[PDB]
Amino acid sequence: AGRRVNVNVGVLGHIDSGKTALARALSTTARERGITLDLGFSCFSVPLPARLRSSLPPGEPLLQVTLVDCPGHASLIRTIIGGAQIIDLMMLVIDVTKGMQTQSAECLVIGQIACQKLVVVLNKIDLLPEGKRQAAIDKMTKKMQKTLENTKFRGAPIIPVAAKPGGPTEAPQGIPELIELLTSQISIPTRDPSGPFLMSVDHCFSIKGQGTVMTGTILSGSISLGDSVEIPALKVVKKVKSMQMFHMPITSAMQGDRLGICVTQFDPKLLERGLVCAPESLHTVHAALISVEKIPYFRGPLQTKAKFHITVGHETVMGRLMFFSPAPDNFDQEPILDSFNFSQEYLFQEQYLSKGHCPRQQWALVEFEKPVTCPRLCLVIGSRLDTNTCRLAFHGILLHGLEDRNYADSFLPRLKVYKLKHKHGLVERAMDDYSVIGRSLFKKETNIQLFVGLKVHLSTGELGIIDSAFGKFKIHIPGGLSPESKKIEPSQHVVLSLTFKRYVFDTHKRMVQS
């Protein structure tokens, strides 16, 4: 054959929509095994569109399209997410008799947060009776355009096809048109091989003679023979002996390609799936600062200290969250997605602010239950997996990873997150025109000596300065109690305003007033 370019194209959808029947139906045009438990890979070749010659590194050039057939069962969502990080376009498959099902929504949300283009595929069309057939498709079609109105796939194509007519042997319908649409729809990114080398491994096995082989998809950069790769899951660097692709051995490879690499033998079952990359370029983290955006279909709040499933790149782990927002002086401030500013203060938030117009950017502090090796600025997704609604809660960017395991002692002091406290108490007696003995606002943590000098305010409107305790505590009022207060059945309360920095001022016991 001739020279070719690979594009990875996923197949997503509900639990029985025909994703595997359609991936197979597409490869045979250009048997029926059970449900799908991990990413299935197959491919087909097609003449290269003239608009893609700018991406090529005898026969007419070809476009090879790797199908990435995903699972559909709901227990396996953490794989569907991993498969979306290796594709460019995605086919969402719809059981045309059933429309959007529970995982069709989840897979679309994934699509908005990972891939660039979408194609909707209405399958199981033989099920429809020919009389009410074409009339029904237009309803489902129009229902889909509406469903995609809000999203970034607003004008995405919608194709009808029957990947296996009749139940579980006729011929599959509408496949030559779907191959031609994918061909016109495929867009190709920059494909620049400069930067870090990163590769997602989907299969690993030993060949008794020549080492251990890893097939997978290059996400970043380039690699050539002789290079060394780190395998973080084993904490060992190995040398690249051999590389094959398109049934031929090669010497180099760049982002977007899918190949197999041969290295010195290790135990393959030690790295089933996972990442591989240029040595000492991924960082392991116990915690991280990541920007947060809520996902709308998630009927529910996002509460600080709640526990989520967090997908950091291609590895998911549990973590507890602590949200925060800009200093209210900077709600209108631009969102920053590539860095984190530590020269500013941040308002603690017991909950994410979902629409008092909300802020343009919010953040969080993920504290992982186990370390996570991951790239910088990767993509974070939160979810609630441990019904019949969206389980995907939020998404964002890994803006700053904390590699020290003592980040709480060693590094957090740099993060100016303050809680805004505002407490209420009563006044009892007056011991002078400038004294006042009020109380009933503090707790059994009567460390009142912690506040001896802080400004307080009374319902009358005079600025008291706290003194020592007497039980209960004393106050000074340099301005003299007001007449209205001297008379005082009315009561005349007090209010205190402090900022409690969660870690910053934490190193100490006293709070901040300003």
Ligand SMILES: Nc1nc2c(ncn2[C@@H]2O[C@H](COP(=O)(O)OP(=O)(O)CP(=O)(O)O)[C@@H](O)[C@H]2O)c(=O)[nH]1
């Ligand atoms: N009647 C009819 N059934 C179809 C058609 N296409 C697929 N099916 C049925 O869909 C059922 C499940 O689809 P299958 O491809 O096996 O799995 P899937 O769609 O990838 C969903 P998962 O991978 O989670 O099992 C199959 O048993 C098959 O009989 C079709 O065109 N007409």
Ligand SMILES: [Mg+2]
């Ligand atoms: Mg399947």
